[PDB]
Amino acid sequence: IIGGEFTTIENQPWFAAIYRRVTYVCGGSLISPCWVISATHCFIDYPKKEDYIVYLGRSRLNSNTQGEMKFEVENLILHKDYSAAHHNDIALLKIRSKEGRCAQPSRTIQTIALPSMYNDPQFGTSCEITGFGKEQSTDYLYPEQLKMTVVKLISHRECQQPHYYGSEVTTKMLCAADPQWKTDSCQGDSGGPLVCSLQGRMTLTGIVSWGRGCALKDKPGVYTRVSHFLPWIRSHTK
Ligand SMILES: CCOC(=O)c1ccc2nc(N)sc2c1
Numbered sequence: 412i413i414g415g416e417f418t419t420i421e422n423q424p425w426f427a428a429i430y431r432r433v434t435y436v437c438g439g440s441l442i443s444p445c446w447v448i449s450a451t452h453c454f455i456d457y458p459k460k461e462d463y464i465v466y467l468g469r470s471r472l473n474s475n476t477q478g479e480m481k482f483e484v485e486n487l488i489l490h491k492d493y494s495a496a497h498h499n500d501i502a503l504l505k506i507r508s509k510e511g512r513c514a515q516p517s518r519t520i521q522t523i524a525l526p527s528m529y530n531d532p533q534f535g536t537s538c539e540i541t542g543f544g545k546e547q548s549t550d551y552l553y554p555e556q557l558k559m560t561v562v563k564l565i566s567h568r569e570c571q572q573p574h575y576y577g578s579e580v581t582t583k584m585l586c587a588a589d590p591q592w593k594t595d596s597c598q599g600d601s602g603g604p605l606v607c608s609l610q611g612r613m614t615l616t617g618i619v620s621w622g623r624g625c626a627l628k629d630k631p632g633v634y635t636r637v638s639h640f641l642p643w644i645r646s647h648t649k
Contacts, residue, residue: 412542413626414594415560419470420479422559423541424521426604428466429504431457435553438542438603439504440615441467441522445513446648447504449602450618450635451489452497460484465506468519470557472543478519482506488647490640496579500620500635502602503647523604526614526638531585534566538587538607538616540632544599548625553599560594562587564607565631575629583639585617588631596632597625605634 420426427439427447437453447465454463463484470476486505493499506513514520532538541559545552570576570586580586587605589595596619605617617634624630637644 412540412544412558412560412600413546413597414589415558417554417556418559419557420468420476420519423557423604424468424519425523426541426557428469428472428543429453429602430464430466431462433464435472435543435599436463437601438619439465440604440618441514441520442525442615443522443648445506447506448615448618448644449502449504450500450620451493451502452495452500452620453602454487454489454502455493458487458489460487463487463504465504467514468517472553472555474555476519478517480508480514480520482508482514490643495621497621498581499583501618501640501643503644523606523615524612525641525644526609526616528641529638530609531616531636531638532564532607532609534564536564536607537561538564538605540587540596540600540603540605540619542596542600542603542619545597545625548597562589562594562632570631575631576623576633580633583636584620585634585636586631587617587634589626592626592628595626596622
């Protein structure tokens with residue numbers, strides 16, 4: 412996350428940290444006790460379950476947070492109509508601990524609700540993104556602390572402009588950005604939550620998916636339009 416501020420898991424009790432062996436991979440969003448939704452592109456190269464470690468209630472990248480839970484990946488469901496721009500960038504991780512249980516709601520652990528089907532906030536709305544991604548594009552390292560910021564929804568017409576992202580953007584993706592392009596998601600923030608308060612309720616509007624650079628003029632971050640995948644989400648979590 413470029414710019415923004417630092418935070419703790421208490422401000423995104425649903426955000427998940429996914430590792431692999433052990434290095435960070437991507438973020439995730441706990442949408443229910445046993446289910447974490449993230450982005451496919453994050454796992455396509457090592458599509459195997461046995462390698463992933465998921466954490467909930469974790470506020471730091473390489474040190475523990477009092478109260479976090481560690482989970483294995485019972486199942487790694489990747490969308491079948493993927494290419495990557497990146498299409499159907501949506502993944503589902505079934506989580507189970509060595510004790511066999513799913514996630515237990517706590518002060519630093521809670522689930523996030525999905526939107527009403529095909530229902531998205533109007534463009535210009537302020538949503539918040541969360542993650543352990545670079546603070547700057549030249550950084551080699553990722554921040555040790557969890558960060559977050561706010562970005563506004565860009566209409567599909569604006570993001571389609573050849574001088575924006577052209578045809579690469581589809582009705583199934585949302586664009587979001589800072590009017591001055593100073594804050595934004597960056598490498599390391601993929602999969603995680605694009606939360607907007609809609610209808611007066613916090614909802615998972617998108618999943619950090621892709622973008623040309625980080626905080627560059629006319630180059631919004633792109634997010635998987637969650638509201639266009641509920642039957643997929645519903646069927647695959649059954
Ligand atoms: C995880 C792969 O890292 C990137 O290369 C990368 C680059 C730009 C970008 N903009 C976003 N909203 S997510 C993102 C990821």
